[PDB]
Amino acid sequence: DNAVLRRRVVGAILMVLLGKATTLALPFAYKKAVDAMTLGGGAQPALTVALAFVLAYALGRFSGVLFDNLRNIVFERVGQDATRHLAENVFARLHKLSLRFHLARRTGEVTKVIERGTKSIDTMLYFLLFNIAPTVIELTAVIVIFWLNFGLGLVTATILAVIAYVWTTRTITEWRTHLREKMNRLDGQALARAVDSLLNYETVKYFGAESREEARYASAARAYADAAVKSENSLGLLNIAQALIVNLLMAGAMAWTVYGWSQGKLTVGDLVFVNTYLTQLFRPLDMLGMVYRTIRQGLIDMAEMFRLIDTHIEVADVPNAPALVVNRPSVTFDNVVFGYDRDREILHGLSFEVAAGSRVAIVGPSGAGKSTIARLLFRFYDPWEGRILIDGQDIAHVTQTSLRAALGIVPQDSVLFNDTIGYNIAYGRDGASRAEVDAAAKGAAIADFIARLPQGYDTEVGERGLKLSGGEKQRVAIARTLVKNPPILLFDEATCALDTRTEQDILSTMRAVASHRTTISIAHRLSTIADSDTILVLDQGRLAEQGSHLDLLRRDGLYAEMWARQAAESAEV
Amino acid sequence: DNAVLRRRVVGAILMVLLGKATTLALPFAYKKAVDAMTLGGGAQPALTVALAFVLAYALGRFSGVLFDNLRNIVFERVGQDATRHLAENVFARLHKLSLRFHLARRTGEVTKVIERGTKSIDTMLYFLLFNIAPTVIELTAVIVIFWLNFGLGLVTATILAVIAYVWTTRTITEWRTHLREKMNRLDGQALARAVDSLLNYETVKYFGAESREEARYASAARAYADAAVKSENSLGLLNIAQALIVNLLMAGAMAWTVYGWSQGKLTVGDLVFVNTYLTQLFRPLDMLGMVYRTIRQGLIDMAEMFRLIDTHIEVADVPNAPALVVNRPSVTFDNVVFGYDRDREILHGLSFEVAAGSRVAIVGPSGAGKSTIARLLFRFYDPWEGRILIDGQDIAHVTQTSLRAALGIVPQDSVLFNDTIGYNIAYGRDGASRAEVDAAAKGAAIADFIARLPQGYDTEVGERGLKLSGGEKQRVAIARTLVKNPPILLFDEATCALDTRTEQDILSTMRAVASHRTTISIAHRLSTIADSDTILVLDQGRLAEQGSHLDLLRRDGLYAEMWARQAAESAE
Numbered sequence A: 001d002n003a004v005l006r007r008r009v010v011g012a013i014l015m016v017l018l019g020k021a022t023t024l025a026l027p028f029a030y031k032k033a034v035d036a037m038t039l040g041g042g043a044q045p046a047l048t049v050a051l052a053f054v055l056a057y058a059l060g061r062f063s064g065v066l067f068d069n070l071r072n073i074v075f076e077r078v079g080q081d082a083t084r085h086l087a088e089n090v091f092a093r094l095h096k097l098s099l100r101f102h103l104a105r106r107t108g109e110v111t112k113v114i115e116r117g118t119k120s121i122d123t124m125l126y127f128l129l130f131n132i133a134p135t136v137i138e139l140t141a142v143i144v145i146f147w148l149n150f151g152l153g154l155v156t157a158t159i160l161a162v163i164a165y166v167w168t169t170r171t172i173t174e175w176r177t178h179l180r181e182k183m184n185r186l187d188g189q190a191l192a193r194a195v196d197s198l199l200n201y202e203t204v205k206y207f208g209a210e211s212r213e214e215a216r217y218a219s220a221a222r223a224y225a226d227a228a229v230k231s232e233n234s235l236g237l238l239n240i241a242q243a244l245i246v247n248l249l250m251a252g253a254m255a256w257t258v259y260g261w262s263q264g265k266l267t268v269g270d271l272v273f274v275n276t277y278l279t280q281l282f283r284p285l286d287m288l289g290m291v292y293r294t295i296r297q298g299l300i301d302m303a304e305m306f307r308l309i310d311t312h313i314e315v316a317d318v319p320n321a322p323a324l325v326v327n328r329p330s331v332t333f334d335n336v337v338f339g340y341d342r343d344r345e346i347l348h349g350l351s352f353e354v355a356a357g358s359r360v361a362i363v364g365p366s367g368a369g370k371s372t373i374a375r376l377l378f379r380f381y382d383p384w385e386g387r388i389l390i391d392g393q394d395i396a397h398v399t400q401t402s403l404r405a406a407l408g409i410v411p412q413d414s415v416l417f418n419d420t421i422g423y424n425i426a427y428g429r430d431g432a433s434r435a436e437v438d439a440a441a442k443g444a445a446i447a448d449f450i451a452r453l454p455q456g457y458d459t460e461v462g463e464r465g466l467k468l469s470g471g472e473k474q475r476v477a478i479a480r481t482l483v484k485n486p487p488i489l490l491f492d493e494a495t496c497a498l499d500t501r502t503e504q505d506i507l508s509t510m511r512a513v514a515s516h517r518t519t520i521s522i523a524h525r526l527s528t529i530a531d532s533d534t535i536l537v538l539d540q541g542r543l544a545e546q547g548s549h550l551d552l553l554r555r556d557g558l559y560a561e562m563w564a565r566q567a568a569e570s571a572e573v
Numbered sequence B: 001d002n003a004v005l006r007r008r009v010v011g012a013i014l015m016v017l018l019g020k021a022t023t024l025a026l027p028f029a030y031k032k033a034v035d036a037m038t039l040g041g042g043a044q045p046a047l048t049v050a051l052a053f054v055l056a057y058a059l060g061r062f063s064g065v066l067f068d069n070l071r072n073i074v075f076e077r078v079g080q081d082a083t084r085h086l087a088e089n090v091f092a093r094l095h096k097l098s099l100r101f102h103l104a105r106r107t108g109e110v111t112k113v114i115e116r117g118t119k120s121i122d123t124m125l126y127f128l129l130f131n132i133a134p135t136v137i138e139l140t141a142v143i144v145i146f147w148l149n150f151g152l153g154l155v156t157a158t159i160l161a162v163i164a165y166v167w168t169t170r171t172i173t174e175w176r177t178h179l180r181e182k183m184n185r186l187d188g189q190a191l192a193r194a195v196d197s198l199l200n201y202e203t204v205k206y207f208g209a210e211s212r213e214e215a216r217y218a219s220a221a222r223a224y225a226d227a228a229v230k231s232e233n234s235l236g237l238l239n240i241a242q243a244l245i246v247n248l249l250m251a252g253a254m255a256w257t258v259y260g261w262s263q264g265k266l267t268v269g270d271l272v273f274v275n276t277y278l279t280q281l282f283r284p285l286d287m288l289g290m291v292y293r294t295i296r297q298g299l300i301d302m303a304e305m306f307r308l309i310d311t312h313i314e315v316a317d318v319p320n321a322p323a324l325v326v327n328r329p330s331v332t333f334d335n336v337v338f339g340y341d342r343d344r345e346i347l348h349g350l351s352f353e354v355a356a357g358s359r360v361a362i363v364g365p366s367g368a369g370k371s372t373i374a375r376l377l378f379r380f381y382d383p384w385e386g387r388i389l390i391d392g393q394d395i396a397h398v399t400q401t402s403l404r405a406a407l408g409i410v411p412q413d414s415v416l417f418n419d420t421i422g423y424n425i426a427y428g429r430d431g432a433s434r435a436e437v438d439a440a441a442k443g444a445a446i447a448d449f450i451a452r453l454p455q456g457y458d459t460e461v462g463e464r465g466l467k468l469s470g471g472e473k474q475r476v477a478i479a480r481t482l483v484k485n486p487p488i489l490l491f492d493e494a495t496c497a498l499d500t501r502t503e504q505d506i507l508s509t510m511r512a513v514a515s516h517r518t519t520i521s522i523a524h525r526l527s528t529i530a531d532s533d534t535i536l537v538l539d540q541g542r543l544a545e546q547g548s549h550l551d552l553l554r555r556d557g558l559y560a561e562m563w564a565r566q567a568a569e570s571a572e
């Protein structure tokens, strides 16, 4: 499909084909030895035979290694391009996976699987292109030559020996696959435990549990080491068996050649021809058994890695899915029944209406499942029963991209890229201008703060934005979501980490930006949302109350009681 | 350390010597062939030489492969144990590093460096132990036997050839180290970018920026691919140069021997002997080249890892540091000046007293440095000026372990292990019993909730505990700190994501058991902490006000102002 890559692969194949010329170099030494022993010296060609033998041998070895390295240097571009394309596809498809995977994944084992599969595919492609075909050509050439100069019984013996070789290799590989899989699993578990400890370094320091993490990693490492010892011992046993088979076959061949006659067909040269061809045959078959085991391992690793990527995507677009068109940002929950796992149901027929352009609050006790409303509105999961509508359009029947582009959310636990503040803020919109970033930072009340910083927008935030304060991180999230500027805006506990001045500023910003935008604010402090158009009270995953602040307060229900418990702080300390 | 591996390693060395014996066994079989050319054949006496040829050659090759695999099978345990010990030490020292490193690290590149070093130490140890010594033995044996059997010229030529080989290898390695380092840096950067995107999957989905992350990772990957192509091309050039040198040396060695006489310069069998020795001499040098370059690369990589593992730990114990003795859990900040970076200072002479057993709140605007008080109280950093005292004892002069064991913290951003709820709760104390876990879950108001769960304590929380609710996660952190049961307890905005009922229940359950325990609560909502014994107001890193809620409200200071802004009723 690529003319450059085609040409490169053709050149590489020519390079391996030159291996056949290298194999043809040995019969030159055969002929020279035959001449030297048939004339016994005293003739003219002896000086010629010596010079030709030394020159041909040295140049043949040098040309073999030179062609191997030229093949490597010419194929390195194609190999690295294949690795890059595989890595890009794996990354892209890894970002397409469902949220349940990322929420319950273990970084160490998935990283081990990804790297092992990528390296196995690289090695497998390399060996498939550069080992399979030349070894077949060499086997056919050996068969033909052995048929012309060794008869038929010897070629049948060699075929029976390679058949026994294949049978023993298959049996030992079937025995060793279990140990290999156990080793890989233990390695993955060890790396996952180590990565989890590194992610919880702060917790370990808080609880002084360095020794416990070290001990658990040491236990995992000892398990992996024992499994690896077992696997490599089985590999050594396989190699010893294969070498025994090949060496006894070679011994039989040499025995037949010498037993034919003390002088043989040719006194000097027959032994040398046989030994050279048998070296050129034992060197590749001893590695060919390993190459069969390597193809097996690469197949099981491709099957392993591919069994993880693109295998379980919870949310997928329906065929010919149209794009979402939001003319009126209205939200409808129609008898939505949903639970994260079928073991525990979270939402039991939740139904409500959020009018277009209104500011609606969602309150309730902990565990009520408001973040469930936020995640289902974003189509991270699909509800068991009922449906979600935006402008009267089913969320499940519209493309994910348009739906998620019509929604902006300031989540409860926000994560920032390991980059500058300006990058994180401009991440809200592709190619955001500095004027939009400045306007959003003014709206998110970090303008003066960024001005007081030495690097300004170029201030580093570190990994996950932990080099900033909580309020600064929350304001950065608000700023990026304002950069996005979607028609529907969902604040999941936005004003938790904010001080009083920032709290009032962000609240006024939310009230001012609610002009033609629907606003859904999940808050634990009722006073911050008492001015909302409607307040939805959740309890155990059900809509207990709905209405204005005065309406829910007059009903003397759950919202009123909650408002009488929070207001107890100011009335009487 | 006693005979654990000694016998085993001795066996490995024995195997290596047996390999030399095999290498010495082959020329003898050739010597017999020389005899077969001096006796002119025979009816029966030729058969002996034939049988000797077949037996010696076949058994020599089979025994070589068998001894190699036996050496591997006996040394695999030692190799895996060495790799395991190095990995354990690397992990331990990685946990010993300062918090400034972990806060500003990049996971992908550090993980890549660690894994590269882990594989490199194994490969390097194998090649060093099984190539360096046998190649030296073979070179010395070839030198002595040759010197005995040809004179001086060819040994002078061989030593000059090895000197030129070493010089060319050194030059090409010095030229290729730059490309290798650039390739490694690009690989680390690409992996770091990919890991950051995987950590921010949720942000990417929130803003639909999959294409941008894919494009940036593709750019990093193509850069790494170009660097790797250059490095491997230079490697191929080095290999062809080395092979040319060795093959020309072999060719010259054969040419000198043949020029003496057609059958033999000194002895007739010396030419076949020489060519066999040249094969047995090229077999180890083809490994010696890659072993030289691999030892160089492994040393420079492990030094690079250790130059990142041996980075200076900001917080270290003073020599002969005593243990902390907390009889009255009081906290004192004495003119503490500290900033994270010298370009921006955070705390400017902060001084305050938190009495033993009192309930103290820490409030103020953003940037006032309350999380700095929490991080410095735990000695994550050391202050520029001033000091911190616990029960009148300097934090800087006590062991880190006792200090951190005397303090429990529910941080603002809590992280949970990717494990069950019971594991996370019992993590508060080493070997926590089930009764203690139950008592803490009851105190943290998650007992009944866990009872309502299908798996109960065995419910998975996922990575960082994101499979739980915010309030559930905060209460799990509270449960861990209650399991630890320290005399000083610091809540950095702990009860924000809790509803009022659960918050009040937990706080009252604490207050009942809050006897002789210091409580330090950092809160942004003042009304939740108006019942504290004392309230410390911070501004620009200084203690502006201190006192009760009624006192600070009557004083009409900063606390009153902050309390009058939240009290603004926006309800219609």
Ligand SMILES: Nc1ncnc2c1ncn2[C@@H]1O[C@H](COP(=O)(O)OP(=O)(O)OP(=O)(O)O)[C@@H](O)[C@H]1O
Pocket (backbone or CB within 6 Å): A100, A103, A340, A341, A346, A365, A366, A367, A368, A369, A370, A371, A372, A373, B466, B467, B468, B469, B470, B471, B472, B497, B498, B499
């Ligand atoms: N990925 C998940 N897997 C399993 N259960 C989940 C997952 N996400 C949420 N839940 C469950 O759904 C319920 C709702 O929790 P959620 O994260 O919605 O917090 P909330 O109740 O909305 O508010 P708060 O943070 O105050 O508790 C909880 O019981 C929680 O255990």
Ligand SMILES: Nc1ncnc2c1ncn2[C@@H]1O[C@H](COP(=O)(O)OP(=O)(O)OP(=O)(O)O)[C@@H](O)[C@H]1O
Pocket (backbone or CB within 6 Å): A466, A467, A468, A469, A470, A471, A472, A497, A499, B103, B340, B341, B346, B364, B365, B366, B367, B368, B369, B370, B371, B372, B373
């Ligand atoms: N790890 C860090 N590295 C560098 N600078 C930091 C770090 N953490 C915070 N800062 C900066 O220094 C100031 C120190 O305040 P810190 O975040 O420690 O607590 P705080 O000011 O009480 O937070 P809040 O904003 O919740 O009041 C912060 O406002 C922030 O600008």
